[PDB]
Structure formats: structure tokens, C-alpha cells
From Swiss-Prot, chain D:
The chain holds residues 3948 to 4137 of 7096 of the full protein. Residues 1-73 are annotated as: Disordered. Residues 1-190 form the RdRp Nsp8 cofactor domain. This is Non-structural protein 8. Plays a role in viral RNA synthesis. Forms a hexadecamer with nsp7 (8 subunits of each) that may participate in viral replication by acting as a primase. Alternatively, may synthesize substantially longer products than oligonucleotide primers. Interacts with ribosome signal recognition particle RNA (SRP). Together with NSP9, suppress protein integration into the cell membrane, thereby disrupting host immune defenses. It is found in: Host cytoplasm, Host perinuclear region; Host cytoplasm; Host endoplasmic reticulum. LRR repeats lie at residues 30-57. Changing N113S: In strain: Omicron/BA.2.75. Interacts with nsp7, nsp13 and nsp12 to form the replication-transcription complex (RTC): nsp12, nsp7, two subunits of nsp8, and up to two subunits of nsp13. Eight copies of nsp7 and eight copies of nsp8 assemble to form a heterohexadecamer dsRNA-encircling ring structure.
Amino acid sequence: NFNVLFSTVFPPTSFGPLVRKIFVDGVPFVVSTGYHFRELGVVHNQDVNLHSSRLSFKELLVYAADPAMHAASGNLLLDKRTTCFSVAALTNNVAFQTVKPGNF
Amino acid sequence: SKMSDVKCTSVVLLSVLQQLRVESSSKLWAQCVQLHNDILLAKDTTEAFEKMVSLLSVLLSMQGAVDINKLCEEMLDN
Amino acid sequence: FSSLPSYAAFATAQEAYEQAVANGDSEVVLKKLKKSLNVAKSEFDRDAAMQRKLEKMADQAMTQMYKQARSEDKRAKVTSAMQTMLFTMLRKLDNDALNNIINNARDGCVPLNIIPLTTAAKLMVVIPDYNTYKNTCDGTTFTYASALWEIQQVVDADSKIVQLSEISMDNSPNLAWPLIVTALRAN
Amino acid sequence: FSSLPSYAAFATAQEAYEQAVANGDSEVVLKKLKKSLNVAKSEFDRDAAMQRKLEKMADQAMTQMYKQARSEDKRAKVTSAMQTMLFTMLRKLDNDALNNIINNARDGCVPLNIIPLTTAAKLMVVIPDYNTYKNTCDGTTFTYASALWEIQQVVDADSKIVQLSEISMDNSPNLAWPLIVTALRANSAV
RNA sequence: UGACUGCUCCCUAGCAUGCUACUACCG
RNA sequence: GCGGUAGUAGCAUGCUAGGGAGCAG
């Protein structure tokens, strides 16, 4: 309850996942190893290994669901259609989706 | 009975327009969608008819598209 | 189910046993006849239901394949079906403005943009022959879609302005005919 | 179903018993015939039932092992696809600006929302109307996020090229307005 | 491009249980 | 003479599995 009130002062770009650089067989990655909540404060992961050999299936699944790599390997985006915070654009084009009528 | 008929005709007309790759032009598709959504919400049967004329003008002003004359000689529209 | 050898055997056994019993006889003959009859009766009775289940199952399978074929056929003629249906409903509506514009488009006078509804905004049509001009445009007013419009500009295929007084019966056939009238909606 | 181990004995006993019956012998041979054939059919019964149970069990086992093998093959291919995607997206990290801002951190951790803001090479802007356009990206170079960007291309909602000479107040109502502007970082990254 | 739950109807396949029936063995 | 057992057929009951569809938040 107190954190909710106090979090409205600090800048909005300091909230969310916290990333760092890890090495897998000499190549560098970018993965999320914590979070900064507006309500729960700062949370750090408990099992993080920087240097590791070739990764398994569940590590692939975890690293493929993290938004860290997708956001870090994308272009900057400034969207004026909405007033919500924007992070990045994953492609070079914007997709517009329509809805079709029914059948009689 | 003269209002549900025009709503069904508007639905069919929008389907036909969508089949002709009209949504590849954002302005025309937006206008067509607005007209179609406005017809279905009508309460009196004069505004619906003028909007129906406006919507049918979109299909009529496309030269290649369809054959008005063949589709009028099949014991269809006069 | 009277087309199987089991039916024939069961029928012959039934007839023989019935005749022997009706003639009147002892116990051992009846016992032997029924012991030779019941096996054939069971043989008949099994197939009597197996054939029925096979026949109904075959009928259901043919039904399902017909339905699949018909659905696959139907989902491949949608454009023509929808166009024919739309023009049928447009017939059934029976409105004067819609009929006017449909006949005009059928004879060659189609618009170039969306027909406006306000007391303002421009409308452009194409008039390909003198007869259509005679029917629609008379004077300085324009009648289209069961409304009234006021001509303000005439443009030819060569994009040169043509004044209204120029167009006449014999004075026309020296012109680029696909004219383009631009009018506004009269009050 | 016709060459079972007990089939030979059953058929031979049936043939011999029926030959004895056709010989028209006494009732004792008939009773022996009946008993022998009854026990022969009784012993043939389980030999005809257990085999049919076993075949269906074996078929079910084969089907289950086949589907297990197919599942393993699918797992292998999805693993390969995920590895390829990760290693392909790795190759665009711009490993000098990222390293420059990582080393400035006091322990190696930085917020994710400021990585594209300080290391990206391209910027995309979506503009609703002309009033917003003339306040954000007017001209050929503009400033955003404490950096200088220069325009490279402008397209519309239909993905067709639009030149800056026709983005004006008079010509505004003739464009598919959700315009997308692409720029490059000047003097820094691209 | 197609989220998380809940309920209901239809068709097929298997399993378990019960009812009846037909032969056979045993006492 | 009665019961038990072993197959076979029809019928009914409840679950599991697969497919098609409908409604509600």
C-alpha cells in the first residue's frame, strides 16, 4: 500500500525487468535476472549462472519467452496514437488488422 | 419488413465489396465500414436508404469489377 | 434376410420338424430334431442382425461422404453465389433511387466517387453518348439518384472545357465524348 | 485361425468320430464320439480366444511405441528451430554501445526499457494527423530522447512511398494518414 | 491472427457391470 | 433331477478416449 503511493514519484523507465550479460560457450547473451515492481520493490533471481555450457530444452524455453532479447534486438518506437508507454518495434512495418462482416 | 430487408442487403453488399479486395485502400474501407455499421443501427427507413445508395455507389464506380449487364440479364436486377 | 444359406438350412429344418411334430411322434425324435434345429436357428439369427448393422453403417458412410463433397463444392463458388444473391435482393427491394442508378450504370453512366448526402460536396459522373445527356441533363440542372444537381463544369477526354451551349444534336459529333460532369446537390 | 496347435488333433478326432458314426456302429461309440468331440471343442475354445486377445495387445503396443517415436522426432525439430531463432537474433546486438552502457552500471544490471532508448540504430514514428506531425518530426532532422535523428523514408497506411514535399496543410486530406516515419541516429549509430 | 473456464446435445471406438438366450462339461 | 463352469449372440447401464456443434462469463 505504501509502495503504491511512493512509486508515483520515480521515473517510469526504471520499472520492469533487469537484464545483464551472460556467456554460453564464449558467446554473449542478454537475459533477465530480476524485476522491479511498482508494488513489490526490487526482486533478484536466486539461481543465475554466468558461464555455462550448451543449454538444455527448458533453458531454451525460458530464454525464448523472455522479452529481453526481443526488445534488445529491435528498433526504437515512438507511437503517438496512444498515451501508453512504448518499448520497441519488432519489424520494419506496422500491421493493421480488420474485422469482416457475417454471412447471410 | 422494409427495414430488415435493407439491413440484410447491406450485409450482403459489404460481403461482396470485401470479396473484391477493397480493404487494400484504407480510406475507402473505412468509409464502407462506417456506412455499413450505421445502416444496422438505424431506426427509421429513410436514412438507411440514403446510406444504402451511398454504399452501392462504391460498387458501381468500379469499371472492371463485375458485369452489371450480365448480372441484370439472368432474371436478376432491372 | 432370406438370401443366405443359413436361412435355407433353418427353413428346411423348421419344415421337417413341424411336419414330424404335426404328424405326431415320440420324445427322442423331437429331442433330436430340436438339437439339429437350434444350431441352424442361431446361425440364422446372428447374421439377421449383422447384415442390418452393416447396411445401416454403409448408408451412414455414404451420407457422410456426400456431405463432405457438397461442402467442398459449396465453398468454391462463393463470389458468383454472393453476387447473384445480392442482385436478387436488390431487385426485391424495389426502390426508385437504386433502380435509377442501377439502370444508369447498366447503360454506361457510372459515378467516379462516393455519392454525397449533404447539401454540398462534388459529384462526378461519366456520360458516354448524347442520348444519356439528353435524358439526364436538360437545361442547367442534373437529375441523378432521384435528386437534383446543378452542372458547373464539363470536361472531355482531352481535358478541355466545353460550354453547355456547345452540346447539340448535330453539333456534338465532333467531340471527345466521354464527358465528365461535376455538379453539387441542389437544396 | 486354421493352423493352431490343437487344430490337428481336433480335426482328426472329429473326422474319426464322424467316420465311426457313418459306420452305423452301436450307441457306445456314439457316446464316446459325443464326449470326445465335446472335450475337443472345449479345449479348442481357449486356444482360439487367448491368441486373439494377444494379437490385439501386441497391436496396441506397436501403435503406442510408433506415436512415441513421432513425438520424439517433433521435439528434436522444435529444439533445432528454437536454437536457430536465438542464434539468429543474437547477431544484431551492436556489441559496442551495449558494452559501453553495461560497464557504466555499478553491478552489471540495467533496466530493459533504456536499452533501445540508448543503443538502437533506427527509430519508427507513427503519426495520427498533421497537427501532431508538425510538432514532432517537422523538417528533415528532429531531436528525440536527447539525440539527433534524420529522416530516411515516409510511408502511409497502405505502405506506399510519400515525399515530404506533399505533407502540407492543404494536401493533408488526400493521404492515408497513419504515416510511419523512419530515421537514423546521426553521428552515433547509423 | 483464434485466450481461460463452466454446462449441454450428436456420432464412433474401448472397458466394466447387469438381463436374456444357444450349445458343452461337471457333479 | 437341480446347480456350477466354458465359450457364443442379442439387449440394457455407467465411465474413458476421439470427432462435430450450441450457449454463458
